[PDB]
Amino acid sequence: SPQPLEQIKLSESQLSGRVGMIEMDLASGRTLTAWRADERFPMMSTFKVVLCGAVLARVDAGDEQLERKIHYRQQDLVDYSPVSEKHLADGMTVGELCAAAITMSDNSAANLLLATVGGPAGLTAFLRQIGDNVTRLDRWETELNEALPGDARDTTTPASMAATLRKLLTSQRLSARSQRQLLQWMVDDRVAGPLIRSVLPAGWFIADKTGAGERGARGIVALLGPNNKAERIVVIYLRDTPASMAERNQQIAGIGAALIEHWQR
Ligand SMILES: OC[C@H]1O[C@H](O[C@H]2[C@H](O)[C@@H](O)[C@H](OCCCCCCC3CCCCC3)O[C@@H]2CO)[C@H](O)[C@@H](O)[C@@H]1O
Ligand SMILES: *C(=O)N1C[C@H](NOS(=O)(=O)O)CC[C@H]1C(N)=O
């Protein structure tokens, strides 16, 4: 491969769309590679990690329990709800809802959880409380994926998302058990985790959440590292490209290949 920044540029040229990326040391927060890291991109389903951060903060404060069963109705459901469509009868716990949202990208689960944290405005307020003044949620599933050109709604920046993920996973804003739970939900992603592992060299750790939206919007938030350790946060967003889902996936994989090849930096 070319160096990471060279590959990122190449990806952007080949996609005819915009790429945004941060590679950040998880322990120290140092930024190692950055490309358009202060530009706005739709979060899409990647927002569900921050959502469940806000849920966990409520559990730590005694204002929520992961065991609390939420009974919901069919009229509540939106598109892509593979897990929540199974539990109309008996409901799902708050914790099961987070697992469904993060590990199966269940959109209705995400909306149920958004209710519990005060909606998009409430999640945004949580973001401001942990010192993220950039990321914003404005809408519910599935309208938050619309990705209208130049629309700041439901966006983050690579730099802000990476910093926020580090805060949630490592800063002790969340309790020890909560940090461990949030990490484990990302380890357990069924949507892209196993696919990523199938192309990773032996010895490389992955935990992740992916997303997709309109106008080619695609993204991943991840923890990655050699020696079976989560060494770095990697955030990649794509927007405004007419490329196929397959070519967007391949281009993200190519950036990952370059990071691996030139890891020592
Ligand atoms: O010398 C480093 C390694 O080089 C190759 O590994 C290849 C691998 O065979 C290929 O499948 C992958 O594709 C990239 C797969 C990327 C998947 C992770 C992508 C995510 C993770 C973080 C968020 C953004 C993207 O590249 C690496 C590096 O060249 C060799 O196969 C391997 O034996 C060797 O250990
Ligand atoms: C999140 O971006 N959404 C939920 C679902 N799966 O996302 S993923 O496969 O990219 O992880 C479908 C895409 C999407 C959506 N449009 O709501």
Of 143, 135, 115, 126, the C-alpha closest to 57 is: 126
Strands 92-93 and 69-70: antiparallel
Q: Domain 1-265 has what CATH class?
A: alpha beta
Quick count: other Cβ atoms within 10 Å of Cβ 18? 17
Task: Determine whether 1 is an active site residue.
Answer: no
Which residues does 205 contact at the CB level (< 8 Å), separation at least 6? 223, 224, 225, 226, 228, 229, 230, 231
Task: Determine whether 45 is an active site residue.
Answer: yes
**In whole angstroms, what separates CA 26 from the centre of its chain?**
15
Amino acid in position 12: E
CA of 104 to the centre of ligand 1 (A): 24
Q: Could you tell me how many helices (H) and strands (E) the chain has, helices first?
A: 9, 9
Sheet holding 31-35, edge to edge: 31-35, 18-25, 232-239, 218-225, 205-212
b (16+ CB within 10 A) / e for 111-133: bbbbebbebbeebbebbeebebe
Amino acid in position 243: A
8 A C-beta contact, residue 34 and residue 28: no
Strands 155-156 and 232-239: unpaired
CA of 263 to the centre of ligand 1 (A): 11
Q: Which atom of ligand 2 is nearest to the CA of 144?
A: 17
SS3 assignment, position 33: strand
Domain boundaries, the chain: 1-265
Experimental resolution (Å): 1.4
Strands 218-225 and 205-212: antiparallel
Positive or negative, the CA dihedral 198, 208, 206, 214 is positive
* Main-chain phi, psi angles of 152, to 5 degrees: -80, -10
Strand extents, DSSP E, the chain: 18-25, 31-35, 41-42, 69-70, 92-93, 155-156, 205-212, 218-225, 232-239
8 A C-beta contact, residue 156 and residue 125: no
Of 10, 17, 20, the C-alpha closest to 149 is: 17
Residue in the structure block whose two tokens are 């389903």: 45
Backbone dihedral region of 99: left (phi > 0), alpha (psi from -120 to 50 degrees) or beta?
A: alpha
DSSP state of 201: P
Amino acid in position 231: E
Query: For 158, how many CA atoms within 13 A lie in the half-sphere containing its CB?
Result: 27
Of 125, 154, 127, the C-alpha closest to 138 is: 154
CA of 246 to the centre of ligand 2 (A): 15
8 A C-beta contact, residue 88 and residue 66: no
Of 227, 189, 195, 225, the C-alpha closest to 208 is: 189
Nearest ligand to residue 23 Cα: 1
Q: Which of 11, 12, 23, 45 is catalytic?
A: 45
Of 12, 2, 3, 8, the C-alpha closest to 22 is: 8
Residue 48 annotated as part of some ligand binding site: yes
